[PDB]
Amino acid sequence: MGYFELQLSALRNVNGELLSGACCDGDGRTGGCGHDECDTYVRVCLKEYQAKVTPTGPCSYGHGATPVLGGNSFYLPPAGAAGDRARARADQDPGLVVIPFQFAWPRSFTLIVEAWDWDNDTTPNEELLIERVSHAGMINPEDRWKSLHFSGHVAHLELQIRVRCDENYYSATCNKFCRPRNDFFGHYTCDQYGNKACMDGWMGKECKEAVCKQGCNLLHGGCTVPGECRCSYGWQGRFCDECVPYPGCVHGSCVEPWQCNCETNWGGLLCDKDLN
Ligand SMILES: *[C@@H]1O[C@H](COC2O[C@@H](C)[C@@H](O)[C@@H](O)[C@@H]2O)[C@@H](O[C@@H]2O[C@H](CO)[C@@H](O[C@@H]3O[C@H](CO)[C@@H](O)[C@H](O)[C@@H]3O)[C@H](O)[C@H]2NC(C)=O)[C@H](O)[C@H]1NC(C)=O
Ligand SMILES: [Ca+2]
Ligand SMILES: [Ca+2]
Ligand SMILES: [Ca+2]
Ligand SMILES: [Cl-]
C-alpha cells in the first residue's frame, strides 16, 4: 500500500484559449480574449506503461483532480523538503493531488495531466479542454520530489511527483509488511527492506529469545527479561553459582544443593543444637 503524489506549481496560458482555438469564457470564436479568464483546474490520470503513449483512458492505477487554482496563468508553491515540513504544520494545499493504491507498485507508469475550464456545471464537455500532456516513465518510492516540464500546444506546465509507501510497508513495491512489536510474538523493529531487527538484548528468529546477564550460569538459571539471571530451585547468587543449603540449615554449609554439613560442636539435622 502506498500513495502517488503530484504537485502543480506553474501554468502559463498567455492567450487564454482552449485547445480548440476559442476563448475560455466568451463567444466561441476560433485584441486578446477579454477579462473573463479561464477558470483553470487539473485532472490527473495514472495508468500502465505504454511504449507509445495514447491520450486515452481508463486510468488503471487511479485518478484525482483539483478545484479552480487560478486564471489564465498563475504560480503556486513548489514541492520539496522545505515544503514538506511547511505542510506538516498545517486546510490543505489545493494544487496537491494524492492517489492512494493497494496493489504492488509496478515502478513503471504513464501519467496524463489535463487542464480544464470550469463553468459551474458537472456535465462532461470535451470542448472545455485547455491542454493535455503525458509522460511515460519510471519511479521508485522515496520522499524526494522529481520535477517534470511540459510545453504543449497551448499551455506550459511545471509539476513535481513522488511515490511513498504507507506506514509499516517497505520494499520498492510498497507490498512488504513489517510492524514493530514487543509482546509474546516477538521484540523487533523494521529496517528499510521490511526485515525484522531485534531490539537490544534479544535474539532468535522472531526475536523471542532473550540474552541473560553476562556471567549467568545457564546450567542453574535463565532469564525471561534481558540482562537478568534467575536461578533454578536449589541455587542462588548474582550468577546463580552458589548452592542453597537444606531448608532450615543454621550452622551448616553446602557445596551441592540441599546439603547441611554442621560446623564443629553443632548437631542436629539443621545444625542448630549447641553441643557445649
Ligand atoms: C463556481 O465554481 C467555482 C469553482 O470552485 C470549485 O471548483 C470546482 C471545479 C469544484 O471542485 C468545486 O467543488 C469548487 O468549490 C466556485 O468558486 C469557489 O468556491 C469555493 C466554495 O464556494 C471556494 O472554496 C473555499 O474557500 C474559502 C476561503 O476563501 C474557505 O473558507 C471555504 O471553506 C472553501 O474552502 C473557492 O475558493 C472558490 N474559488 C474561486 C476561484 O472563486 C464558485 O463558488 C462557483 N459559483 C457558483 C455560483 O456556484
Ligand atoms: Ca467556459
Ligand atoms: Ca472565467
Ligand atoms: Ca469558465
Ligand atoms: Cl510564451
Author numbering: 27 to 56, 60 to 119, 124 to 309
Question: How does the study describe this entry?
Answer:
The Notch signalling pathway is conserved across all metazoan species and plays key roles in many aspects of cell biology including cell‐fate determination, stem cell maintenance, immune system activation and angiogenesis in humans (Guruharsha et al, 2012; Bray, 2016). Aberrant Notch signalling results in a number of inherited and acquired disorders, including various cancers, and it is therefore a key target for therapeutic intervention (Hansson et al, 2004; Groth & Fortini, 2012). Both the Notch receptors and the ligands are single‐pass type I transmembrane proteins, and direct protein–protein contact between adjacent cells initiates an intracellular signalling pathway. All of the Notch ligands have a modular extracellular architecture consisting of an N‐terminal C2 domain (formerly known as the MNNL domain), a Delta/Serrate/Lag‐2 (DSL) domain, and either 16 (Jagged1/Jagged2), 8 (Delta‐like1/Delta‐like4) or 7 (Delta‐like3) EGF repeats. Binding of a Notch ligand to EGF11‐12 of a Notch receptor results in a series of proteolytic cleavages, with the final intra‐membrane cleavage by gamma secretase, causing the release of the intracellular domain of Notch (NICD) from the plasma membrane.
Here, we present the first structures of Jagged2 (N‐EGF2 and N‐EGF3), which has only 58% sequence identity with human Jagged1 (N‐EGF3), together with the longest known structure of a Delta‐like4 ligand (human Delta‐like4 N‐EGF3). Two crystal forms of Jagged2 (N‐EGF2) (green) and one crystal form of Jagged2 (N‐EGF3) (dark green) were solved, including a total of seven crystallographically independent copies of N‐EGF2, and 1 copy of N‐EGF3 (N.b. not all of EGF3 is visible in the electron density). All of these copies have been superposed on each other by alignment of the DSL domain, showing some flexibility in the hinge region between the C2 and DSL domains, and further flexibility in the hinge regions between the EGF domains. However, the angle between adjacent domains can vary subtly, resulting in the ligand structures appearing to fall into two groups, one group including Jagged1, Delta‐like1 and some structures of Jagged2, and the other including Delta‐like4, and some structures of Jagged2. The observation that Jagged2 is split across the two groups suggests that there is some flexibility between adjacent domains of the Notch ligands and that all may be able to adopt these different conformations. It is therefore likely that the conformation seen is determined by crystal packing. The Jagged1 and Jagged2 C2 domains bind calcium ions (shown in red), whereas Delta‐like4 and Delta‐like1 do not; the aspartates involved in calcium binding are not conserved in Delta‐like4 and Delta‐like1. The C2 loops are ordered upon calcium binding in both Jagged1 (Chillakuri et al, 2013) and Jagged2 and contain the amino acid ligands for calcium binding although the number of calcium ions bound differs.
